[PDB]
């Protein structure tokens, strides 16, 4: 119940038009930054796969948000710390634990789903050392906290 109130407070915070109406991206981010990580595929599945126009055409209410959040809370396929560590290990060609920023940049911007460059510069600025290499394990700890 308390988490429901917190989610409603977040929805009220993120309202911009003043109509208490926001598109699906805001709800997706709210769930994303509040204990769950539902990928874009999961978001489409739970929202009926809105198209390019439907994303900003139709909007739902908190009442219809209750069932989808309840269902998503039952999805536990989120990986593990060791799983992420091993997955990142694949790029340690030298075995020294240092991965240059260029390789990870290409991997993220060319493989898998796409992330906006503004998101990259906002979230991935200042942690690069002089040589431009990022410790993947330290990055794992940092992403686990914030």
């Amino acid at each position: 119940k308390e988490q429901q109130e917190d989610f409603k407070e977040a929805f009220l915070l993120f309202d911009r038009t003043g109509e208490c109406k926001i598109t699906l991206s805001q709800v997706g981010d709210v769930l994303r930054a509040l204990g769950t990580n539902p990928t874009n595929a999961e978001v489409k599945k739970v929202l009926g796969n809105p198209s390019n126009e439907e994303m900003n055409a139709k909007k739902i209410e908190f009442e219809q948000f209750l069932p989808m959040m309840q269902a998503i809370s039952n999805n536990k396929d989120q990986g593990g710390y060791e799983d992420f560590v091993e997955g990142l290990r694949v790029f340690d060609k030298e075995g020294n634990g240092t991965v240059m920023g260029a390789e990870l940049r290409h991997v993220l911007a060319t493989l898998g789903e796409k992330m906006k460059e503004e998101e990259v510069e906002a979230l991935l600025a200042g942690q690069e050392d002089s040589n431009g290499c990022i410790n993947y394990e330290a990055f794992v700890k940092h992403i686990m906290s914030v």
Binding site: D29, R32, A33, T36, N37, P38, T39, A41, Q78, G79, D83, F84, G87, L88, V90, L111, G112, E113, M115, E119, L123, I143, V146
Partner: peptide, 18 residues
């Protein structure tokens, strides 16, 4: 398949950070 799943999970975690 495993690396595809790992990439998806990494993207999900990065979005979680955002």
């Amino acid at each position: 398949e495993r690396l595809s799943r790992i990439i998806t999970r990494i993207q999900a975690q990065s979005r979680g950070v955002l």
